[PDB]
């Protein structure tokens, strides 16, 4: 195997699939919506399949109707003009966008800063570019008194500064955050921008859950803050916008001198994406761009629908003493499990507590989730190994089944 | 920009899509079927769109249904039990497959051997891995007196032997060839396997047009030669197989100890491909696999539709003194132009004769084609720049409109 990929072949994720495969288990694990996508997104894929041109090659850098749509959607949010051809790249999900950003932008020997826990791909992407990932963790403050929230987690600004050196090329920021659920604040994003103009670094901002933010909270885009347009790549995703995780299209959006470089990676790796998916996506974005100010718009109605279920899953968790972190955004909730009956002494590994615990819960209670340590670099895992992540983008009947289980839990 | 991408940002094919800009010209340039796809290919994409699970994540290394069908199709072809999880990988086109093969198997400083002219991603794809492309030209033999054909082009076994040394990691082989239309012979494939076996190197085998061989030739797969299974990766296309160019789905077939590395690249780049394209393709495949021996199987009915369009195209090319090379396979035809009015004074600039001629034929005849020099290394163009490539997977209307132009040529 080539050197750029030694030791990046870990897939503990296929184990979590194996887990979840017995069909008498309720899978609250990987981020797999089992609600219906909005009918019109299904309809449009159908319409596009019957148009010959749609089934043939389309534009390397994104289907013109799709990037036309994106440029006008994000035009409004940025309070800007965004240039469909020089400032957008469409790629194989936000996953491929992150690959474009890092491969195009990051050199052997460079430092990239990653906030732990992270979408787990940040780590092996940076090591593959031959760069050094530099970790700094989120760390919790005292509560309000009532509940534990996403907002109770923060980073220490002075610790952050201490991470930047002349070797820092970039920082990767995920907000709304997976797994925490954290929606970053204008104050938190201002400290990060300060440093990556102070130091002349870039900032890769992964904002695929921009539309999922719940009440009390607002998505702010660091790329909109003074001095950051020049130096930010902000990445979005079809799968999370439109509950269509199987479409696998996403976008990078930033300045031409950076998008250039993403562009060359795409051109030399897979070249173009699928045409019917982009065609149909662009119709769906149109159906929703035009009603942004109504609640019938998917950007509004989905978080409204998911908030109810967030609060339903908090309660369920609380009802067995799994101590939940009510999330500000996204559609995972994390729960401390340690005040549960630590019960795994006879399970023979030095994996982390949470893998062992999730294994046990899957065996005995018939529910699966994901251990937070999966989202941690190896030196950080002990600080996070009693934490476990559940996904709630699910239909009622699934939250029902899970309700069944927690009632009978003791 | 990252060093890995230095000067791989030229896309001369943006300028060609400029000439295809459409002052009533018949565009005979890019590989862009304008026939319809098979009706059931389209049908299954729609059916899929309406199933909710068909719009959510699937197995990262290929939709299970889909790798099942590949394994059953290719096992019929390889004469062997092919394991659908460990010997296949589904990627974003053949284009993504080659990228997987290279990134995961080639190191900086390895040498990779390439036959010119070559599908044009090979040089950059290998150059991006920091390897050194080593080139060897295809050369003409005396014709049988009667016709020029793709099999009048071959390689020199001793010249090939001398491009191998201990830095050679691999040779890239493309058959049927784009743009020659050559179907490599058993005897030619034999000389390659000898050198791969003696030098312990890999062969990456690009066989997307593998079903498009015409009367008097067979596709044989180098992977099936004694000793080549363990050293070969062989790549196919949804685009080329079902005329669905915008679906961008391809696959690598090969031994576990090679696929696991491609899997690794896949997993740290794009992760999974699209569920609905792949659900439908699977069903497209099953449909044609159950009628392999029948004239209605798309695998038989396509080559046969196409032979006729080819023979039509050779006449037209002759009608007007463009000396065509009749291809044994694929859906491109190359034509020698040297002997017309040759005569391009408007067009100062040593860039290459074929580019100037394609520009000319666009302006004055409203026909576009692709200059063959575009599939060469720089040191090879002079040996190929009187050659021009035309595409014929075209509906009757389109070839019709071509007749009217050759008919009016003089």
């Amino acid at each position: 195997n080539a050197k750029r990929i030694e030791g990046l072949d870990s897939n503990v994720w296929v184990e979590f699939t194996k887990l979840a495969a017995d069909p008498s288990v309720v899978n609250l694990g990987q981020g797999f919506p089992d609600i219906s996508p909005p009918s019109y997104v299904k309809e449009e894929l159908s319409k596009a399949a019957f148009i010959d041109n749609m089934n043939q090659y389309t534009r390397g850098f994104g289907h013109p109707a799709l990037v036309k749509a994106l440029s006008c959607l994000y035009g409004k949010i940025y309070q800007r003009q965004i240039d469909p051809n020089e400032e957008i790249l469409v790629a194989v999900g936000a996953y491929g966008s992150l690959f474009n950003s890092i491969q195009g932008l990051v050199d052997p020997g460079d430092e990239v800063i990653i906030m732990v826990p992270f979408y787990d791909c940040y780590e092996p992407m940076v090591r593959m570019a031959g760069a050094v990932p530099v970790f700094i963790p989120l760390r919790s403050k005292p509560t309000d008194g009532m509940k534990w929230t996403s907002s109770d987690w923060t980073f220490d600004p002075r610790e952050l500064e201490s991470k930047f050196s002349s070797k820092t090329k970039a920082i990767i920021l995920n907000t709304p955050h997976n797994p925490l659920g954290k929606v970053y604040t204008r104050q938190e994003l201002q400290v990060i921008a300060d440093l990556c103009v102070k130091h002349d670094t870039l900032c890769i901002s992964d904002e695929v859950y921009e539309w999922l933010v719940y009440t009390g909270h607002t998505h702010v885009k660091i790329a909109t803050l003074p001095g950051m347009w020049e130096r930010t790549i902000t990445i979005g995703s079809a799968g999370k916008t439109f509950s269509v995780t199987g479409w696998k299209l996403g976008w990078s959006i930033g300045p031409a001198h950076l998008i250039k470089h993403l562009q060359t990676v795409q051109q030399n790796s897979f070249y173009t994406c699928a045409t019917p998916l982009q065609a149909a996506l662009a119709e769906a974005f149109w159906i929703d761009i035009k009603r942004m100010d109504d609640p019938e718009c998917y950007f509004n109605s989905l978080p409204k629908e998911l908030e109810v279920k967030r609060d339903r899953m908090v309660r369920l968790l609380n009802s067995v003493g799994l101590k939940p972190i009510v999330p500000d955004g996204g559609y995972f909730i994390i729960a401390d499990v340690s005040s549960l009956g630590a019960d795994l002494s006879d399970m023979n590994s030095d994996e982390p507590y949470d893998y062992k615990f999730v294994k046990w819960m899957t065996k005995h209670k018939k529910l699966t989730a994901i251990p937070v340590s999966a989202f941690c670099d190896s030196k950080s895992k002990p600080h996070f190994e009693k934490l476990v992540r559940f996904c709630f983008i699910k239909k009622d009947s699934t939250l029902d089944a899970a309700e069944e289980i927690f009632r009978a839990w003791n």
Side-chain angles (χ1 to χ4, degrees), chain A residues 98 102 112-115 122-123 125-126 170-174 184 202-206:
Chain A
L98 283 147
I102 288 160
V112 182
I113 295 166
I114 307 173
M115 261 157 296
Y122 301 167
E123 204 188 352
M125 281 164 190
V126 2
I171 197 206
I172 297 165
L173 142 81
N174 184 204
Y184 282 64
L202 318 182
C203 163
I204 304 171
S205 167
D206 173 354

Side-chain angles (χ1 to χ4, degrees), chain A residues 11-24:
Chain A
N11 201 223
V12 275
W13 274 80
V14 298
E15 282 175 48
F16 310 143
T17 291
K18 225 116 95 59
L19 267 216
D22 166 349
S24 105

Side-chain angles (χ1 to χ4, degrees), chain A residues 93-405:
Chain A
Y95 211 102
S97 317
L98 283 147
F99 189 78
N100 286 326
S101 308
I102 288 160
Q103 288 274 309
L105 283 192
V106 180
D107 275 324
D110 275 341
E111 291 170 358
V112 182
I113 295 166
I114 307 173
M115 261 157 296
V116 19
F118 44 91
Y119 195 66
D120 66 338
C121 91
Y122 301 167
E123 204 188 352
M125 281 164 190
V126 2
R127 319 198 103 119
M128 201 174 157
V132 357
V134 167
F135 304 108
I136 178 182
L138 267 20
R139 340 174 80 133
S140 61
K141 312 178 280 158
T143 256
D144 70 1
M146 258 81 78
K147 14 85 123 120
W148 200 6
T149 86
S150 259
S151 295
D152 289 317
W153 287 74
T154 190
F155 56 89
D156 175 340
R158 304 178 59 246
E159 198 186 355
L160 193 56
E161 180 142 32
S162 92
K163 304 295 178 178
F164 283 79
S165 73
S166 79
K167 276 286 174 79
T168 310
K169 167 47 73 70
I171 197 206
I172 297 165
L173 142 81
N174 184 204
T175 196
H177 186 272
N178 178 2
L180 250 42
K182 183 193 166 43
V183 175
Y184 282 64
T185 58
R186 200 177 280 278
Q187 303 71 27
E188 291 167 342
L189 316 172
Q190 175 69 59
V191 165
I192 293 159
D194 290 359
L195 301 159
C196 314
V197 321
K198 173 127 155 171
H199 278 266
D200 208 3
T201 71
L202 318 182
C203 163
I204 304 171
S205 167
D206 173 354
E207 306 188 357
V208 310
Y209 303 110
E210 48 186 338
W211 306 105
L212 306 197
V213 349
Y214 309 116
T215 129
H217 285 92
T218 290
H219 197 62
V220 174
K221 280 184 172 302
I222 195 180
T224 59
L225 249 52
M228 307 289 303
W229 168 261
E230 316 75 279
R231 66 173 16 92
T232 314
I233 287 295
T234 311
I235 298 187
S237 152
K240 335 293 158 77
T241 302
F242 280 110
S243 297
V244 111
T245 65
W247 289 31
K248 280 297 272 189
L249 298 166
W251 36 95
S252 289
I253 290 190
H257 66 285
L258 318 163
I259 294 278
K260 252 193 273 298
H261 307 327
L262 277 62
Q263 261 172 10
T264 309
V265 164
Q266 158 112 184
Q267 181 182 340
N268 296 292
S269 60
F270 65 90
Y271 201 77
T272 187
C273 306
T275 312
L277 310 158
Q278 309 183 56
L281 182 43
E283 285 321 341
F285 270 113
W286 290 123
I287 278 138
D288 285 308
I289 277 151
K290 293 163 171 191
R291 49 186 191 180
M292 286 176 94
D293 277 331
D294 315 326
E296 313 278 355
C297 180
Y298 206 51
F299 311 149
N300 306 131
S301 85
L302 178 70
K304 185 188 83 276
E305 179 207 326
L306 291 180
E307 192 165 324
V308 176
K309 319 206 183 182
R310 190 190 63 174
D311 287 359
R312 179 175 194 203
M313 268 247 311
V314 171
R315 290 191 304 266
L316 290 178
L317 295 162
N318 266 333
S319 93
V320 307
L322 287 186
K323 182 169 79 249
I325 306 181
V326 14
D328 310 318
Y331 60 38
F332 308 99
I333 158 115
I334 288 181
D336 193 309
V337 299
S338 56
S339 96
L340 219 38
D343 197 334
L344 320 158
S345 303
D346 38 357
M347 215 195 296
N348 258 91
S349 219
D350 65 340
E351 329 212 61
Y353 196 90
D354 53 4
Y355 296 53
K356 274 154 159 203
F357 180 103
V358 171
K359 263 156 175 122
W360 175 83
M361 199 179 67
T362 297
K363 187 137 88 168
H364 289 251
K365 313 260 137 229
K366 256 66 206 205
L367 198 59
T368 62
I370 293 293
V372 175
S373 65
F375 298 96
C376 291
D377 57 293
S378 90
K379 177 176 170 335
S380 264
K381 299 185 198 265
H383 311 284
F384 290 96
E385 67 173 345
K386 330 281 267 227
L387 294 190
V388 143
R389 186 204 75 173
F390 292 80
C391 167
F392 61 84
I393 179 160
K394 309 289 189 182
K395 36 185 209 190
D396 291 342
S397 47
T398 298
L399 299 167
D400 286 352
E403 182 126 8
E404 246 87 287
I405 292 194

